[PDB]
Amino acid sequence: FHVEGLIAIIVFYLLILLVGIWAAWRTKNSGSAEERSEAIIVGGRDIGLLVGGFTMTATWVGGGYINGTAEAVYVPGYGLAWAQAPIGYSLSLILGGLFFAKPMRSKGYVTMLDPFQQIYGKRMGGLLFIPALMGEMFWAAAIFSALGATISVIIDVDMHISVIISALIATLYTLVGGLYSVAYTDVVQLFCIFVGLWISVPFALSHPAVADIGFTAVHAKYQKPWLGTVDSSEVYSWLDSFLLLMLGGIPWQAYFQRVLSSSSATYAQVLSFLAAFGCLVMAIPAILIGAIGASTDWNQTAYGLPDPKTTEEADMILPIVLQYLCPVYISFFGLGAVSAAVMSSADSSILSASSMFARNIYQLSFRQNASDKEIVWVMRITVFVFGASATAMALLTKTVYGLWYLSSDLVYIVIFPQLLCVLFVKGTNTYGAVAGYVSGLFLRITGGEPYLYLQPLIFYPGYYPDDNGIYNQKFPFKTLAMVTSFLTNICISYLAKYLFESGTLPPKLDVFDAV
Numbered sequence: 001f002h003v004e005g006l007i008a009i010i011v012f013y014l015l016i017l018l019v020g021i022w023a024a025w026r027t028k029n030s031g032s033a034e035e036r037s038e039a040i041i042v043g044g045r046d047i048g049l050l051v052g053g054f055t056m057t058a059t060w061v062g063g064g065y066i067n068g069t070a071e072a073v074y075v076p077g078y079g080l081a082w083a084q085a086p087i088g089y090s091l092s093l094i095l096g097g098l099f100f101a102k103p104m105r106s107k108g109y110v111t112m113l114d115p116f117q118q119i120y121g122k123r124m125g126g127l128l129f130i131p132a133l134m135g136e137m138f139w140a141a142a143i144f145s146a147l148g149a150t151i152s153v154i155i156d157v158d159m160h161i162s163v164i165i166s167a168l169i170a171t172l173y174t175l176v177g178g179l180y181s182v183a184y185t186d187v188v189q190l191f192c193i194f195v196g197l198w199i200s201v202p203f204a205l206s207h208p209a210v211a212d213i214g215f216t217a218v219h220a221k222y223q224k225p226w227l228g229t230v231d232s233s234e235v236y237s238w239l240d241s242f243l244l245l246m247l248g249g250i251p252w253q254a255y256f257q258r259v260l261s262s263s264s265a266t267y268a269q270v271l272s273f274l275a276a277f278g279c280l281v282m283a284i285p286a287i288l289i290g291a292i293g294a295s296t297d298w299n300q301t302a303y304g305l306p307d308p309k310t311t312e313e314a315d316m317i318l319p320i321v322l323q324y325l326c327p328v329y330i331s332f333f334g335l336g337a338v339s340a341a342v343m344s345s346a347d348s349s350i351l352s353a354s355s356m357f358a359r360n361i362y363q364l365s366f367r368q369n370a371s372d373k374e375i376v377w378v379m380r381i382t383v384f385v386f387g388a389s390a391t392a393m394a395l396l397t398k399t400v401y402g403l404w405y406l407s408s409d410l411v412y413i414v415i416f417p418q419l420l421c422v423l424f425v426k427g428t429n430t431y432g433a434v435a436g437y438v439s440g441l442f443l444r445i446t447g448g449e450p451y452l453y454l455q456p457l458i459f460y461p462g463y464y465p466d467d468n469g470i471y472n473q474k475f476p477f478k479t480l481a482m483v484t485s486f487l488t489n490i491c492i493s494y495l496a497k498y499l500f501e502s503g504t505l506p507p508k509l510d511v512f513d514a515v
């Protein structure tokens with residue numbers, strides 16, 4: 001109901017949009033003359049270390065990660081040792097920039113699936129494009145729903161209007177400016193989230209009511225000592241989640257698009273390392289906010305005796321702290337920081353998915369004669385369509401976090417093993433890749449999603465028949481699936497690639513090219 005909140009938010013939006021358009025105008029005429037087909041997707045192959053590092057740091061830290069870290073820190077049963085998102089992201093980026101992204105940039109690509117369409121073919125590229133698009137779209141939709149909840153609670157305005165205007169801003173961004181605008185707006189929002197998060201903490205910390213975390217950490221508190229141990233019963237599950245965050249974060253058109261624009265491979269790996277450092281340094285505010293929220297005495301605050309953890313409203317602790325433990329003019333800063341992180345992740349995801357589609361699907365499946373113009377038209381139209389679909393998914397999907405998680409498992413199981421095979425383990429043909437993708441899909445689908453009821457059927461040891469009926473299992477069931485898929489891929493690919501010249505084995509038939 002605060003009229004000045006609308007003023008501040010719209011001023012922020014208009015200013016940063018002006019920055020994005022001012023960035024796009026200069027590089028309107030950039031790259032080669034006939035580079036209109038690929039200027040958007042490639043970024044001119046010339047960005048600095050600073051810009052790329054800031055962009056990647058803003059891309060991974062997109063608000064949803066902040067909320068997840070706060071939840072893992074705050075919710076009882078969880079703990080700081082259960083907040084594997086920051087550490088997972090940091091070591092994922094370090095491993096990426098150290099091992100991968102050297103040969104991905106040294107040769108010179110445009111999208112992720114370039115090795116896929118080079119070694120398997122267009123037929124496999126058009127089938128492997130789906131998981132990345134689905135994952136990016138559901139991630140963006142979940143982050144949008146988070147933004148809507150934050151707005152609808154911090155300000156009295158409804159979530160629909162704010163979500164739709166933010167989506168309109170992102171669509172204008174990825175229409176007008178290809179990659180330079182996204183990068184410069186990423187640096188703007190990264191600074192914004194840094195300053196907002198690190199200015200909203202001390203005011204809440206020194207509240208007269210909340211007990212100091214210097215003691216509210218070890219002995220006995222209202223919620224729980226927020227450290228959080230790993231149960232001897234379940235250490236596999238934590239291993240599985242940690243592995244998923246380490247490895248499933250590597251294959252992503254966001255990071256791959258950022259590395260595919262560095263001026264040189266060395267600058268690309270330094271970009272990845274600096275992005276990891278930035279994620280590490282931006283982790284701390286989320287942990288501090290979680291500690292602040294966990295140490296409160298909610299009865300004597302303005303929220304009331306029913307704690308958020310006791311009202312099933314704990315899914316959004318950070319806005320509660322922002323709007324209750326801090327005054328109005330710092331609550332606005334915190335809300336702006338959250339919105340900026342959301343926009344960074346949203347624009348990165350939309351640009352990545354639309355780039356992948358508009359290049360790889362369109363050029364290599366439908367049209368190659370329209371070499372320059374219709375390609376840029378396809379990118380802009382696809383960006384707009386994906387923005388509209390993001391609006392629809394954010395608006396009318398009650399269960400979107402489950403879709404986000406399911407797409408994360410799908411990517412981490414099907415994309416990473418094939419990417420690793422085509423990069424480091426040569427000799428694999430399309431037969432083994434097809435079989436491994438099929439096996440991974442079967443293992444994921446028949447294993448049963450915890451948040452819906454497609455088919456939760458497995459005799460997996462340690463399956464837990466909880467109250468809602470989702471007999472989920474505590475054994476990893478995800479890393480074992482991915483390792484089985486990768487091993488099956490490599491083994492049968494090698495067996496076929498040798499068997500094709502043995503006997504009546506493939507003397508005549510060739511389902512796909514093998515010689």
Ligand SMILES: *[C@@H]1O[C@H](CO)[C@@H](O[C@@H]2O[C@H](CO)[C@@H](O[C@@H]3O[C@H](CO)[C@@H](O)[C@H](O)[C@@H]3O)[C@H](O)[C@H]2NC(C)=O)[C@H](O)[C@H]1NC(C)=O
Pocket residue numbers: 299300305
């Ligand atoms: C949660 O916080 C509330 C404060 O909003 C606590 O209420 C407080 O309760 C005590 C105990 O009754 C009140 O002290 C005395 O209350 C009587 C009425 O029963 C009154 O006639 C006396 O003059 C004296 O105030 C105290 O006033 C009250 N707080 C306020 C602000 O009025 C509540 O006890 C807390 N929950 C728990 C479990 O302690």
Ligand SMILES: C[N+]1(C)CCO[C@@](O)(c2ccc(-c3ccc([C@@]4(O)C[N+](C)(C)CCO4)cc3)cc2)C1
Pocket residue numbers: 060068071072139241245248249252404405408
């Ligand atoms: C306890 N909950 C609330 C329910 C699910 O388990 C959690 O601990 C949780 C939260 C987030 C994730 C998560 C998984 C994948 C991804 C992602 O798609 C995001 N990126 C694409 C940004 C990189 C990593 O892959 C992000 C977050 C996984 C588990 C959070």
